[PDB]
Amino acid sequence: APSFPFSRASGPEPPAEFAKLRATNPVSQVKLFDGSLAWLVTKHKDVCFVATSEKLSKVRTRQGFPELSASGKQAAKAKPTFVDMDPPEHMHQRSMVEPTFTPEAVKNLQPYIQRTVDDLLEQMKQKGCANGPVDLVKEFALPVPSYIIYTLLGVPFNDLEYLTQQNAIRTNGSSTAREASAANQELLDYLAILVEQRLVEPKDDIISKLCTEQVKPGNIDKSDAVQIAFLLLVAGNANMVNMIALGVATLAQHPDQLAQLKANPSLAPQFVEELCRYHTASALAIKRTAKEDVMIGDKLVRANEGIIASNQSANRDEEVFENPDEFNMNRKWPPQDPLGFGFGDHRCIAEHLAKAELTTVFSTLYQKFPDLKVAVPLGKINYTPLNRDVGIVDLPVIF
Ligand code: HEM
């Protein structure tokens, strides 16, 4: 059994193993860092099955849960939030914060999302690039999602820049372990003060709704409100930054699709759909243990065995998406959902928000900067390390 996680074939590519597995051994065992085995599921139909089967559990205290690193094993000891819950606990807690993220709520947030993108783009223009390239990640891909989720949580405008930097430090490849852990606990300490403040005087933000609707009636405690707020911050922010940067690189890589998007910004939603299929920035979250025996394809997954369902692989499944390794914004979509945001009851709470942020970015960026260019050769883009989820660390641009 091969070691898992697998490394990407190159900067912008999935691991090479998945295509071969889909063709010749779609449900197979892999070896995790601790020597334990897990079942790896690679076909779209089977990933959806894993995502939805009530015979499977997300609870990390079940033996056989496929932790992929030493750090994950240690994080499993903590009081879980809804990301690691099964029904009925899962929706009992998730429903406390889903209102801000519904399709209708996100449609009403569109003018705010647009303003945030417009202001950061105008910022960038004022900075200018007269003295040379600027980093699109630091100047734009990082602050767009950061400012939005912090604002929705309740952070005031003057604190956004500092906290945006600190949250980046938590996941920056270059941070030492100490630096990332200090940033982590710093964010937590900050959120704990906001919860104290919003309990005494609520405002129009997610933390206030938690305080008023859940903490004060005793449904959860202050510490739970902090952890829920924290989960909303850290679960998706790095994914958003990576998807923005990857989208700019992808357009540069396929000039006539960029030309189409510039000529017709109304194409941004379909560009974003293709982007979230082709670049599956979160490929390791659909994990389970079997509560009881379950058959998947030609395999028996026994009780207390772990399962990893690769949505990245599913998004390249030739049986579902014709010419899956082709980036095509004009893709003819099948009835089966792309799985960039997962599937089933745990499907990304923020899927609609994330797509709206991305659509806003890709319908505005090249109207603002029609001559935006990556300022290094595309082959020299600094991607995340190959043993991680796909992403971009920094992206020099001119405009
Ligand atoms: C493009 C950006 C994003 C991508 C690709 C992404 C992807 C995902 C995926 C693959 C999952 C796993 C879903 C499953 O278990 O089937 C997930 C879960 C989740 N995401 Fe996102 N996400 C993004 C942005 C966000 C944002 C902006 C937030 C918060 C504001 C967020 C919050 C969450 C939460 C809380 C979960 C756990 C849901 C649950 O288990 O019930 N995500 N996301």
Curated annotation (Swiss-Prot):
<dbReference type="GO" id="GO:0016705">
    <property type="term" value="F:oxidoreductase activity, acting on paired donors, with incorporation or reduction of molecular oxygen"/>
</dbReference>
<dbReference type="InterPro" id="IPR036396">
    <property type="entry name" value="Cyt_P450_sf"/>
</dbReference>
<keyword id="KW-0007">Acetylation</keyword>
<comment type="function">
    <text>Nitric oxide reductase which is involved in a dissimilatory reduction of nitrite. Acts as a nitric oxide reductase. Is able to reduce nitrate and nitrite to a gaseous form of N(2)O when oxygen supply is limited or discontinued. May function as a detoxification mechanism.</text>
</comment>
<dbReference type="GO" id="GO:0020037">
    <property type="term" value="F:heme binding"/>
</dbReference>
<keyword id="KW-0349">Heme</keyword>
<dbReference type="GO" id="GO:0004497">
    <property type="term" value="F:monooxygenase activity"/>
</dbReference>
<dbReference type="GO" id="GO:0005506">
    <property type="term" value="F:iron ion binding"/>
</dbReference>
<keyword id="KW-0560">Oxidoreductase</keyword>
<dbReference type="GO" id="GO:0102199">
    <property type="term" value="F:nitric oxide reductase (NAD(P)H) activity"/>
</dbReference>
<keyword id="KW-0408">Iron</keyword>
<keyword id="KW-0479">Metal-binding</keyword>
<protein>
    <recommendedName>
        <fullName>NADP nitrous oxide-forming nitric oxide reductase</fullName>
        <ecNumber>1.7.1.14</ecNumber>
    </recommendedName>
</protein>
<feature type="region of interest" description="Disordered">
    <location>
        <begin position="1"/>
        <end position="17"/>
    </location>
</feature>
<feature type="binding site" description="axial binding residue">
    <location>
        <position position="348"/>
    </location>
    <ligand>
        <name>heme</name>
    </ligand>
</feature>
<dbReference type="InterPro" id="IPR001128">
    <property type="entry name" value="Cyt_P450"/>
</dbReference>
<keyword id="KW-0521">NADP</keyword>
<comment type="similarity">
    <text>Belongs to the cytochrome P450 family.</text>
</comment>
<dbReference type="InterPro" id="IPR002397">
    <property type="entry name" value="Cyt_P450_B"/>
</dbReference>
<dbReference type="Pfam" id="PF00067">
    <property type="entry name" value="p450"/>
</dbReference>
<keyword id="KW-0520">NAD</keyword>
<keyword id="KW-0503">Monooxygenase</keyword>
<dbReference type="InterPro" id="IPR017972">
    <property type="entry name" value="Cyt_P450_CS"/>
</dbReference>
